[PDB]
Each structure stands twice: as structure tokens, then as C-alpha cells.
Amino acid sequence: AAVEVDVSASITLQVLVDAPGNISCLWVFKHSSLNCQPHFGVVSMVILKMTETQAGEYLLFIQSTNYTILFTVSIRNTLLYTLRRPYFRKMENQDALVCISESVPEPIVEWVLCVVKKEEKVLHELFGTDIRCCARNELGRECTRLFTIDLNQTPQTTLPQLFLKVGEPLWIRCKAVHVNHGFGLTWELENKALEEGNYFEMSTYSTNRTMIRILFAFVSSVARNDTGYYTCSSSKHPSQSALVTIVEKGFINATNSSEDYEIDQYEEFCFSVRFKAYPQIRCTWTFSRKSFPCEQKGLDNGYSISKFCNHKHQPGEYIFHAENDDAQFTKMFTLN
Amino acid sequence: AAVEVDVSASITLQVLVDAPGNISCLWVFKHSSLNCQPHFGVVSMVILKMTETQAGEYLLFIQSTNYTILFTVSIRTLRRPYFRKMENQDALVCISESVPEPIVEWVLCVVKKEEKVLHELFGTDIRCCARNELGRECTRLFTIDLNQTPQTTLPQLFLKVGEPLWIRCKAVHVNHGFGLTWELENKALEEGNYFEMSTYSTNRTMIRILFAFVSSVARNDTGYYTCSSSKHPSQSALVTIVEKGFINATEDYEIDQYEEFCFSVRFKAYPQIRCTWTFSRKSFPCEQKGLDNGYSISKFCNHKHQPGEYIFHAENDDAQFTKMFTLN
Amino acid sequence: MTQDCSFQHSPISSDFAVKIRELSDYLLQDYPVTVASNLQDEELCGGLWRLVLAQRWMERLKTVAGSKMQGLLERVNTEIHFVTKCAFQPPPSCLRFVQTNISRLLQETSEQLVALKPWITRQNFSRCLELQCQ
Amino acid sequence: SHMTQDCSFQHSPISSDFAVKIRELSDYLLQDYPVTVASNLQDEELCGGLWRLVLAQRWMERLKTVAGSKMQGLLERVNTEIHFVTKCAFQPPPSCLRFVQTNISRLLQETSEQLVALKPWITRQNFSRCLELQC
Numbered sequence A: 001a002a003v004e005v006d007v008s009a010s011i012t013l014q015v016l017v018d019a020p021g022n023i024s025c026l027w028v029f030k031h032s033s034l035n036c037q038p039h040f041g042v043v044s045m046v047i048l049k050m051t052e053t054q055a056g057e058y059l060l061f062i063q064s065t066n067y068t069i070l071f072t073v074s075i076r077n078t079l080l081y082t083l084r085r086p087y088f089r090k091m092e093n094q095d096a097l098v099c100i101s102e103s104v105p106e107p108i109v110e111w112v113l114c115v116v117k118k119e120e121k122v123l124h125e126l127f128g129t130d131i132r133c134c135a136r137n138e139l140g141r142e143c144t145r146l147f148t149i150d151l152n153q154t155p156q157t158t159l160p161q162l163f164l165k166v167g168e169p170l171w172i173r174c175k176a177v178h179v180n181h182g183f184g185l186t187w188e189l190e191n192k193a194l195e196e197g198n199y200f201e202m203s204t205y206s207t208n209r210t211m212i213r214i215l216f217a218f219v220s221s222v223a224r225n226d227t228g229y230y231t232c233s234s235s236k237h238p239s240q241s242a243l244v245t246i247v248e249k250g251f252i253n254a255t256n257s258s259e260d261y262e263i264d265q266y267e268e269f270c271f272s273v274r275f276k277a278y279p280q281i282r283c284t285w286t287f288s289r290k291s292f293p294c295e296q297k298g299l300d301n302g303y304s305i306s307k308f309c310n311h312k313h314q315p316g317e318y319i320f321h322a323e324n325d326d327a328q329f330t331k332m333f334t335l336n
Numbered sequence B: 001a002a003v004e005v006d007v008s009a010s011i012t013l014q015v016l017v018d019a020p021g022n023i024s025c026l027w028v029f030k031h032s033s034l035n036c037q038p039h040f041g042v043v044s045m046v047i048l049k050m051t052e053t054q055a056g057e058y059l060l061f062i063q064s065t066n067y068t069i070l071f072t073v074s075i076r077t078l079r080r081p082y083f084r085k086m087e088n089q090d091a092l093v094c095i096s097e098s099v100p101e102p103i104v105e106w107v108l109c110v111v112k113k114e115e116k117v118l119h120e121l122f123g124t125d126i127r128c129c130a131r132n133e134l135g136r137e138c139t140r141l142f143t144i145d146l147n148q149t150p151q152t153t154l155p156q157l158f159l160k161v162g163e164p165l166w167i168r169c170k171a172v173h174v175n176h177g178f179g180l181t182w183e184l185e186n187k188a189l190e191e192g193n194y195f196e197m198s199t200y201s202t203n204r205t206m207i208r209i210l211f212a213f214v215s216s217v218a219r220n221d222t223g224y225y226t227c228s229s230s231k232h233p234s235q236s237a238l239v240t241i242v243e244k245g246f247i248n249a250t251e252d253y254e255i256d257q258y259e260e261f262c263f264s265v266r267f268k269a270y271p272q273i274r275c276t277w278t279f280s281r282k283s284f285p286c287e288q289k290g291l292d293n294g295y296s297i298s299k300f301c302n303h304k305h306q307p308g309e310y311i312f313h314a315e316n317d318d319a320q321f322t323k324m325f326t327l328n
Numbered sequence C: 001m002t003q004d005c006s007f008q009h010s011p012i013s014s015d016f017a018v019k020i021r022e023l024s025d026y027l028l029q030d031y032p033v034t035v036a037s038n039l040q041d042e043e044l045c046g047g048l049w050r051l052v053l054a055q056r057w058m059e060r061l062k063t064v065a066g067s068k069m070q071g072l073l074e075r076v077n078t079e080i081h082f083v084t085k086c087a088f089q090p091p092p093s094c095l096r097f098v099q100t101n102i103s104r105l106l107q108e109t110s111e112q113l114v115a116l117k118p119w120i121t122r123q124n125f126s127r128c129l130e131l132q133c134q
Numbered sequence D: 001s002h003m004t005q006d007c008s009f010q011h012s013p014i015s016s017d018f019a020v021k022i023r024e025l026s027d028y029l030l031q032d033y034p035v036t037v038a039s040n041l042q043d044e045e046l047c048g049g050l051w052r053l054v055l056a057q058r059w060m061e062r063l064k065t066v067a068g069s070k071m072q073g074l075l076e077r078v079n080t081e082i083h084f085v086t087k088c089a090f091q092p093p094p095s096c097l098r099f100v101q102t103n104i105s106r107l108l109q110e111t112s113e114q115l116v117a118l119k120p121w122i123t124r125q126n127f128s129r130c131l132e133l134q135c
């Protein structure tokens, strides 16, 4: 019901009710009347450059039933600080990828191919290694790693699981290295063919006349439809796969039990926490009010293991609080 | 090629050659023969609990080609780097001694170049590093940058009698029209104690290196050294030379578990000392940091309001020391 | 037969224009090379004939190139070496060559790769094996 | 960008690492690129190498104009090693001077050699009589 208009913006305002039939509307603007002609049922009022004049109380009365709607159009006098993780988009111009990271303040967008850093926001040398984009502002650094399937490389005996919220863009690069250029690559889903506007192929040469091929698959905006087991096969390589899980809300799965420990100031020890969580969580190790952040590193098994070592032989409660955009968590660690 | 076996260890020894094909091996153990059946090509000899008997000369002959491999299986010091200018050309060499033999890497700050022989001696922060099983001991090349801003406390350089003195004087100027000169006790330095290198930089800039060196120092060589350039200001550094390794340092205490305090020890010692803070048998090492005044000040804070004798024992290769700190 | 010429998978890389810009960055642009002056107009074999010739030039150049120029040549050579996968017949007596700048040869090579990229795997190039004069 | 006439150098304009900048240029060169060398330079053990360096220097400038963005840097860097010859008012080549086409690899090699032989004497000699090239 609450509308936030950022500057002289050009957007459309539509509302639909599950009953399309011979029904009539009437728009009731800021202390003035307005005529309408909608679609079957969905009604709309679109605006190009919303002036401080074109804002406020906007109602819409309907009759089959005799309904009434009301909207409060406000303006962006407020610009709240944030750090939304990087997204990807293939430049329409050529065979290259672009990093779309949102944040308040605006961040440093750097592509890192592992290590080598190249702050460009537009990456063209997409071939191999560990490719990850990183956003860095006043808040901090949030990174989105490009999901890779190396058919040339050894298999990860875990069958990778890829999670993402409905509407987010799916990105899976399949890289294969072969001696001669004579080999192809193909994408497939469990009992469903891959869309023509969901695939792209790049190729270059390596060392002594070697050929590397990148056959990446992408989804503009994901849905329940797009969730499933994806597989990449090469005409000179073994078919390696990964399953795509669509999520409604963010989650943190960690064996929370609040564990108790005890050691003598002569022993070398580090507190641990294994967790499978999405999106990448913001973690904090707090003790007797003194809070220190964490090296939230990945165990690659199918979870990330966060560690803490600066115990300083100090006894007491070491609490680990970790949280993402749509989920929270806290684990109590007693020490003697 | 050199194998280090720690106790009755259980490890595998495999070697692979980039050519997998119908090739045959033959293992040649310590003065005895042995049969093999490998993988396609990678060959191996694995051992569970390597006894003093199961160690020594172990060869492996192959045939497609007719190759032969040899391994020296052994069972379970680190003297800091020294410098020697290559007699062949205008380049420096790192002489670091150690048991086991170390990784000698030149680091120009940062950029690491493991070569043991450095030819690109121009500017930045040049330091050689030795790295073995024991650890990593580094010797930084003493530099005097006339081009750079001036530092305080007449750069005091300490070294033991017999050690090699190394002072590189770097000056950067617009045109090549400028010279460099070394002086000790306001005199013109020995002919076999100086060397000049030069190269170009950015917009036809010139960098000059006029380094001074002593093969083996004595009490004779100790003194105030100065480098002056014919387009730069004369910056200096004093050299302190001792017969053997030394430790020079300049107590009872009492406090209530409410006061924040740290024990201190100021010392001028060469070479860099290995220090240890021991109390009621429980020993903890120290942050042997430098005070830059003309001595290094070691500190200890984790008193834990615990009363008694806190003893500080510090020692180098040719000297020892201990100081007793009472607490109530 | 062994008198055929076709490619199942694309022997033309996406980043070939990069390797040519990199070679050109260390080249003396007016180095004299040659190009066929009277190649018959054949929109199927045309670029392929010139790539074969350009390819023959990358080899000649490698032999008189410095240690590091050899790498840049070889790397451009790899981008167009696939033409030797086919039994191309030696140039006919009618074929006239004209002296041109290596910058011209490199530029044309890039152009030929671009034009050939969408068709290299769809066409049968068996009749390109005999170079023809217009 | 300086002056000219009478010719001597107080401090060594020849670097120690000049052989490096030449090996680096040569690593990106097409070795038989045609350059020229004077064929009939009078034998003068004092001006000889200096005359050829002046000529080699004139070639580094001509080459920079037809060099690619990255080759320009390698040429310029070798040009700097021998640019000091322009600190002196060298007279234009005489009519008697004949030039012969040679490989740039030959020119680069000779330039290195001339710098080596000139390195111990560049600051001890008065090169005022070298300003006029002789046949």
C-alpha cells in the first residue's frame, strides 16, 4: 500500500483481482477525479516522471460487488544504506560477462580470477581458474562466485547442489580442456531440453595448441520451473552434473546445540562451526561484550566451516551469531 | 632427490613421467634387487614403518628409451644470509648456511625472486631470506636512499668482527649528470671496498648504486660512514663492530589485581636474540620488538595477577643473558 | 576419401582477435610480406585460401623472429593452423603475389577469421584444396 | 632537450644494465628488419663507436615513428641508453659517407658492442673532434 518514488521516475502502477469479468473501475486521485479503461481483471495507472505534484492519496473504486483500493505515493527523501551481493549479466554486445552489484554507498566492483584481481565491472577473459566477483563499499565486501563445472578437472564426490531465490539469475559455466579443438559441449536438465536463450559458447587456445571451451548456461529470472538436475557433457569428456534448488527464503543449517569445553593454558585449540547456509552469512564471534568478526571459510564438502582461535586462554561464554538477509542464528560455547 | 624420514613412518614413494605407454621398470634397493608393477606413466614403492634398515640408496631403472632414477632415504642449524658480490659481473649473491639446506629467495619490495643470485639490485626494499625445516632467517641489505626523505638516530649498524659489511647507497636524479662518494672517519674508502652500478628510469631518469662492502670486519672498520652525491644531500650511518656476539641491557615489583601493567627490558644486542619469559616452569616466548632509539625493548603483559619470579632469558649465537623480576 | 576438408567442431577461437592485437603491439607494421593479388572470387574458399597463405607466412616469420616474437607469432599461428588439417594443393603457376605490410596481412587474417567463423563447421571445403586464379 | 658544442661527459651516461634493454628489444624484433650502417667510416679508435652510436641513435628515432604502441616503449628504452650522444652538436653526415642495408639485429648487436668499448672511456676523453664524422 506504501509507495516509495525515487526522483522523477517513470513506472506503472497495476493491481489484479482473481475474477476477470464485465466489471468497471473509477480512479480517485489527490482531491480530483479520473477515468479508466483496464484489462480482464487487472487495472492500471502508469506515470512518466512522477513530479512532487504527481504524488499522494490515489484511490481506485470498482463495481462488478462494490470494491475500493487506496495507495499512498511518497518520495525518496530517504536513501537507506545497503550491500546487495553481485549478480551477473552477459553483455549483449559481445562474448563477455558483467557484474551487477547493488549498494548504498556505491561499491568497488572487482573481478578476481584465481590469484589475480582485475577491477573492471566487465570481464572478457572468462577462461578457467576460480572466477568470483566482489563488491566493496563502506559496509564491507559481499562476493558472488561464478558456479563452475570443470570436466577437464577431477570430480567432486558430493554431486554439487546450487541454491538460489526465485527471481535471481542462474549462472553455470562449463569448462573443458582438450588437446585438439575436436570436441563439443552440451547442457541438459532431467527430462527437459535447454532453451536457446539460456546457452552461450566461447573458445580459446592454451599452451601447446590446446583448446579450452566455455559452454555456460544462464537463467534471466529463476522460478520453480527452472529448479532441477543440470548436466554438462563433452564430445571428448565425462558428463559431470549439479542440481539446482530454488528457495523461497534464506536459510542457515548448523548443528546448534550450545557446546561446553574446558582446557589448560598449555593446549593449542580452535572453536569450530560447520554450516550449510544461503546466501553467504555475516558472522560474529562475541565474548563478554567484546565482539570479533570471523573467517567464514568453506569446507567444500557441502558446508562452510567458521573457526576462532584467539581464545587467549580466557574462560567463559563464546557466542557465535551468524545471519543472512532472510535468516538468523546463535550458538553458545562454554569454556573452563 | 633427498628424502627425510621422521621415525617409523608409513608413506608412499611415487614418480610420474609425462609419457604413459607400454614401458617396464626394475627397482634397485640398497645393494639388493626388487620387482615392480606400476600404473600408466607412474611407478611407486610404498613403505609402512620405515626401520633404520629400510633406508638408504634406492634406484629405479626404466625401459620404453632406457632411463634410471635414484633416491637418498635419510632419517630425522639455520645461520642467517651473508652477501658476496659475484666476481664475474655487477650482481650480488646470497650465502645462507643451514642444516637442512634452505630455500634462498631474494625479495625486492613486494616481489619475490628465488634465485640465490640477484642482478636487478636497483631500489625498493631488498632482503634475502633463507627457509628450511627449522624456519626462515632473513638478512636485509642496508640501504641509504639520498633520493628519499631522511630518517633519525644516525642509522646505527651493528655487526660481529669477521662478518661482511654491506651498505648500498641509492640516489635518483633527473639527468645522468651526478656522482656518488663514500667516506669513513672523513677519509676516501679502500679501493676494494666500493662498487658502482647505474640504470635508467621512467622519463630518462637515472638511478645510481654506489655500494660499499667489507669482506671480514674488525675493530678497525667500525666508524661513521657517509654517502654524498654530486646533486644530493650527504646522508650518513654509524657502524658498531664487536669482537664476539653481545647482549647489553639496563628488579622487584608489587601491584594489586586492579592495575594494568607490563614488564619491560631494554637491550642493545647483536645478532638478534632468541628470548624467553619463564615463570614457575611455565615458559612463554616474547615480542622482541625494536625501540629504534638505539636498542630493542621486550615486553610481557600476561602477568595474570599471579605473584612471584618472572625470569627473562635472552641469548644469541655467541652470548647469553637472564634477568629476575620479583612480583607481589 | 582423404581428398575432403571439413571441421566438426569450430577451429576458430573467440579470442583470436586478441592474439593478433598482441602480436601487432610488438610489430614493425611495414615489414614486407606478400598476399595473393589474383585469387579467384569464391565466397566459400576465398578467406580459406588467404588463411592458408597467411598461415604459410606465420611459419616463415617464426624462423627470423626473436625468442619472444616467436611466441607471439606461434600464438597467432595456432589460431589459423587448422588450415593444415586439409591437404591444400601447392599454389598454381597463375597465382601472382604482391608485397604488402605485415599489418595489412594481420588485419586481413582477422577479417577472414571473422567471416569464416559462422560457416567453418557447416560447409564442405573439399573443393577449396585447389587454389584458383580469376 | 639540452645544448651541444665541445663534447665531454663528467658522469657516466652509459648505464650498467643497457645490455638488458637491448636483449628485451631484440626479444620482440623481427631480426632482419632493414636498417643501415655507415659502410665507410674512417678508422678512429676514439670517435668510431661514438659516430656509429650517433647513427644508431638516429635510427631509434626513425623506428619509434613506425613502431606499435608496445614496441615504441622498447625502442624508447633503448633510445634512452644511447640518447646522450645528442648532448653534443654532432655535424650532419658528410657527402662522402656511404650507407649499407643491414639487419636491425646487426645494428642492435653493434650498438651493444660500442657501448661496452666506450663505457671505460666516455668520461676520460674529450670528444670535441668527433663532432665531424669522417670517411
Ligand SMILES: *[C@@H]1O[C@H](CO)[C@@H](O)[C@H](O)[C@H]1NC(C)=O
Pocket: A223, A224, A225
Ligand atoms: C517455464 O518457462 C516457459 C517458457 O518461458 C513458460 O511459458 C512457463 O510459464 C514456465 N513455467 C512456470 C511454471 O512458470
Ligand SMILES: *[C@@H]1O[C@H](CO)[C@@H](O)[C@H](O)[C@H]1NC(C)=O
Pocket: A251, A253
Ligand atoms: C535444515 O534442517 C531442517 C531440519 O528440520 C530441514 O527441514 C531443512 O530441509 C534443512 N535445510 C536444507 C537446506 O537442507
Ligand SMILES: *[C@@H]1O[C@H](CO)[C@@H](O)[C@H](O)[C@H]1NC(C)=O
Pocket: A256, A257, A258, A328, A329, A330, A331, A332
Ligand atoms: C541453540 O541452542 C541453545 C541451547 O538450547 C539455545 O540457547 C539457542 O537459543 C539456540 N540458538 C538458535 C539460533 O536456535
Ligand SMILES: *[C@@H]1O[C@H](CO)[C@@H](O)[C@H](O)[C@H]1NC(C)=O
Pocket: B190, B220, B221
Ligand atoms: C684498517 O684497514 C684498512 C683497509 O683499507 C687500512 O687502510 C687501515 O690502515 C687499517 N687500519 C689499521 C690501524 O691497521
